[PDB]
Amino acid sequence: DMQVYIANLGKYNEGELVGAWFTFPIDFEEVKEKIGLNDEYEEYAIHDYELPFTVDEYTSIGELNRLWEMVSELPEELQSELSALLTHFSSIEELSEHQEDIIIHSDCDDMYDVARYYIEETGALGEVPASLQNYIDYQAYGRDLDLSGTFISTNHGIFEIVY
């Protein structure tokens, strides 16, 4: 759970490759004494990992401890879908800039229900007469809410990135 397999730059041939699992936070010296060395300090071969995001094989461990703070800062419904938010954003820092703009529809599951929420519950367009209340198109209004703003659909609800 949110861990790495970080050893080693020594043994490029990887004869009985070592270094199993380290959760966060991470010491340099504890991992270095866990995995040894190649008589000098070149380590953190990030071979395997298990993270909600993507990281390269040459990333410094300080950047991993930097990113872990911002990842563990967020609530679980954000942390369950960090790659889905990364499909619109570009970094965890940029997500941390706008981490209150994202509106979460746990109740709504598809665009019909999003339109029905914005019309029936909120009254964003105005009051709804009851004889009109059944005769309102939701699909075309849902398509125009899709083409106006930016909506992302996940398993839990619908994420709405607002400006």
Binding site: Y118, V162, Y163
Partner: peptide, 10 residues
């Protein structure tokens, strides 16, 4: 403005 959407004064 902040866009012509449902969004409003930021």
């Amino acid at each position: 403005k902040t866009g012509g959407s449902v969004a409003s004064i930021d």
